[PDB]
Each structure stands twice: as C-alpha cells, then as structure tokens.
Amino acid sequence: KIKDPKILGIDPNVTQYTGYLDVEDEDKHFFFWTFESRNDPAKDPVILWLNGGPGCSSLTGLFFALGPSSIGPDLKPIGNPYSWNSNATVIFLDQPVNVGFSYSGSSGVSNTVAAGKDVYNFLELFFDQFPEYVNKGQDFHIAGASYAGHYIPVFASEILSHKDRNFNLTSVLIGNGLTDPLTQYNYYEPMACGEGGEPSVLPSEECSAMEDSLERCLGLIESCYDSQSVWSCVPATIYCNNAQLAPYQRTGRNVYDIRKDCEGGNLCYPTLQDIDDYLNQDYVKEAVGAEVDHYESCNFDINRNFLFAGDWMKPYHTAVTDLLNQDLPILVYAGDKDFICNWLGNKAWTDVLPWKYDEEFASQKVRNWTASITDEVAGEVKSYKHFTYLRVFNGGHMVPFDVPENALSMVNEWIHGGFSL
C-alpha cells in the first residue's frame, strides 16, 4: 500500500512517490522510493538504481551518492546540488527480498538468476501502476554498482526475455562493478602495488604473495565458470578473496578508496552510520509507510547465502555478449580510486569481452573525455557503437559521491547525449 514521501523532508517541488509492490503468491513485498525528474517528467527517462552487497539497501545510494538528499548528524535531510534526477525520474528498489526495507516470511533469493526473477515481477507491477512512465515513450534504463555488476546483466536478460513485456529497456549503467571475476581478479595486485594511479600500498613481499596465490585462484575461477557448481565456486571465492582481498585489508586502507583510509571494523565511511539512523527514526519510517520493524543496511544472511551458493564466482559476464549482441547500448564506468572494483580490472574485462564489434572495440583508441558541466577532463574514453568504457578520474567506490559534478555530467550526457561518450 503506497504512501507519499510528500509528507517527508526530502525533494520538494518534484513529486515523489514511495511504498510497496506486493507479490501475493510468492508473498514477496518489494519496497521502492521514487522521484519525478526535476525537469519534465514526461520527456525525461526513467532509471532503476541498484546497489550491491549482496544484500545491501538501495536507499544507501540515495542518501549518499546520487540522490536528492543526504543525511548529517542532525539526521536532517540535505539538498543535492548534483542529484541524478536533475534530469530524469528515478527508482530506488530494495532488492533483494529482506533487504533494507523489503521483506517476506519465507523465501529464497540465495542467488542471482532468481533475484532478476523477482525484479521483473516488480518492474512489470510498478509500470502498471505508474503507466505515466511509459506511453509518453520514456527511455528506461537500469543502473548500479559493484555486485550489481552480477545482477545487472542477468536482470537485463531476464527482462528482455519477455516479449510479453509491459515496458522497454533502453540501456544499462554499471559502475565500480564485479562482473567478470575471472578476468578482473588479476587486477588486484597491480592495482594495489603502484600501478593504477595511487601508489603501492603494499610491501613487495605482500605483492609477490599475491602473484603466487594467483595461478591457483584463477583455475578455481575457471572451474567454477565451466561447471557452475557449488563445489568449485564456493572455494574459489574464499580462496581468492583470501589471497587477494585480504592483504590490502590488512593495511586498513578503505577498500573503496585507496587514498583515504579506514582501519579494521569501524567505518570506511562513517556518515553511513548516520544514514541507518534517519531510516529507523519514527517519523522517517512512518511517511514511507514501510511495513518493517528494523532497518538494517545489509542483511548478513542473504550475503552468506549468496556466498554459500557459488554466486560471486559465476560467469555473468556471458550475458553482456548477448546484450551487446542484441544491440543494447552499455556503459561500464569506474572511479579510478577504488580497490574493490578497480578501473584496471573493469577496463580489461571490457577490453576482452566478446560480442560482434569485438575486433573493432579492441581497435578503438582511448580518449580524454571532458565533462559536460565543469568543462574539465574528467576521465578516460574507449567508445564503440553502443559499448563504452569510461575510466572516471578522481573516482572512488561510488563515483557520484566523490565527484558529483562529473557523475551527472557522465550521467546525463549518456542518459541524453545518444549512448556515446
């Protein structure tokens, strides 16, 4: 049953709607928080924003990297002088089930293939109830980061599955995402040993450690890709996150920005803690008319199950070729200051993914890209037809948080400048 953030602090002059889509049978209760474009809701496209985890709430990006408002000690909203809906209506879903605000009594989602499945059921609902997003011929895109870089392709296939479809997808945006583990995975050491912008954060000794450990971790990936089994995929994960994620973590440098630190336990970004705060508060929780009792950012379990199901390590990068092959323009961008999902890593997977324009894309040339708004070089281009890879300069795990000007700049000009950079 839907309410209106209307009553809430958040974005005014707009026209924001929020609440829940119900899925009877499965007893699945989706939660979303929407916003009309700040410009003209009628022409301006629509956008599905996706956060990662797995098992983390999307309101997170909303009050923190690319929404209308943020949250300060005063647990009082704050206008974004660079929001994503500056020029488009946006949707903030809480997938999967039991994440942030959504829920169920008994379900699953112990994996990706299936999260998609609930997504398409909700998008199809939602588009019904707010058919003011379509008819008018409103470009629909989905976007996200990190883990959503597993979701995203898979969720996309899914939607493009139905010809039955109650709506159209026009493109996708994946930032600081984990997509082709097998290939991204070697980008660990280089990125942390003085080869990707910032300088070597680890003694040479730790660095060789990574190299020894690699060969064994990559074949584990390979087995998982070819078998897709629990028996290879799970250990592939642990083994790899081990040999590879860990050492960096020992330094205690934020995993999301090698520049800034965050030491073991406490926040790598504290302000978030404030965010989990404004959501639980009694007024806040009310307006939204969210049927849950306690809002947590990430749900341990889901994460565990994903991990315990082989997930993290399955070859979802395969869908990107079908997509590319079915003329679906795609944007892969990365803040070059994140370790978890390096632009080093994300470039190269893109640089070798397969699709018709394969030899072409590998032939294209890198080009410095200026931002629309600020008129300054802002990152680094590789463009080919409807496939583009953008290295975003001065970008950390959430590009829209570190350099918001630039994000919207990347954003809008992609959302609007014809699926090219």
UniProtKB/Swiss-Prot annotation:
Q: Cite the record's statement on how activity depends on temperature.
A: Optimum temperature is 30 degrees Celsius.
Query: Which positions are catalytic residues?
Result: 146, 338, 397
Q: How is its activity regulated?
A: Inhibited by ZPCK.
Traits of the deletion mutant: Leads to vacuolar defects as well as defects in the terminal steps of autophagy, when ATG42 is also deleted. The PCR1/ATG42 double deletion also abrogates the production of phytochelatin and the degradation of glutathione-S-conjugates.
- Amino acids binding substrate: 341, 398
Q: Which residues are glycosylated?
A: 13, 87, 168, 368
Cystines in this chain: 56-298, 193-207, 217-240, 224-233, 262-268
PTM field: Enters the endoplasmic reticulum as an inactive zymogen and is modified by four N-linked core oligosaccharides, giving rise to a precursor known as P1 (67 kDa). As P1 transits through the Golgi, extension of its core oligosaccharides leads to the Golgi-modified P2 precursor (69 kDa). P2 is sorted away from secretory proteins at or beyond a late Golgi compartment and is subsequently delivered to the vacuole via a prevacuolar endosome-like compartment.
According to its record, what are the GO cellular component terms? cytoplasm; endoplasmic reticulum; extracellular region; fungal-type vacuole; fungal-type vacuole lumen; vacuolar lumen
Cite the pH-dependence comment: Optimum pH is 6.5. Active from pH 4.5 to pH 8.5.
Any one GO MF term held by the record is:
serine-type carboxypeptidase activity
Instruction: Report the subcellular localization.
Output: Vacuole lumen
Q: Recite the UniProt keywords alphabetically.
A: Carboxypeptidase, Disulfide bond, Glycoprotein, Hydrolase, Protease, Signal, Vacuole, Zymogen
Enzyme class, UniProt record, top EC level: hydrolase
Q: Which reaction does it catalyse?
A: Release of a C-terminal amino acid with broad specificity
Q: Which domain of life is it from?
A: Eukaryota
Q: Name one GO biological process term.
A: zymogen activation
Q: E.C. number, please?
A: 3.4.16.5
> Does the keyword field hold Signal?
yes
Family recorded in the similarity comment: Belongs to the peptidase S10 family.
Its biological purpose: Vacuolar serine-type carboxypeptidase involved in degradation of small peptides. Digests preferentially peptides containing an aliphatic or hydrophobic residue in P1' position, as well as methionine, leucine or phenylalanine in P1 position of ester substrate. Also plays a role in breakdown of the autophagic body and the autophagosome-dependent protein synthesis. Plays a key role in phytochelatin (PC) synthesis from glutathione (GSH) by cleaving the Gly from GSH and form the PC-peptides of the structure (gamma-Glu-Cys)2-Gly.
The miscellaneous annotation reads: Present with 44000 molecules/cell in log phase SD medium.
State what protein this is by name: Carboxypeptidase Y
Q: Which residues of the full protein are shown?
A: 112 to 532 of 532
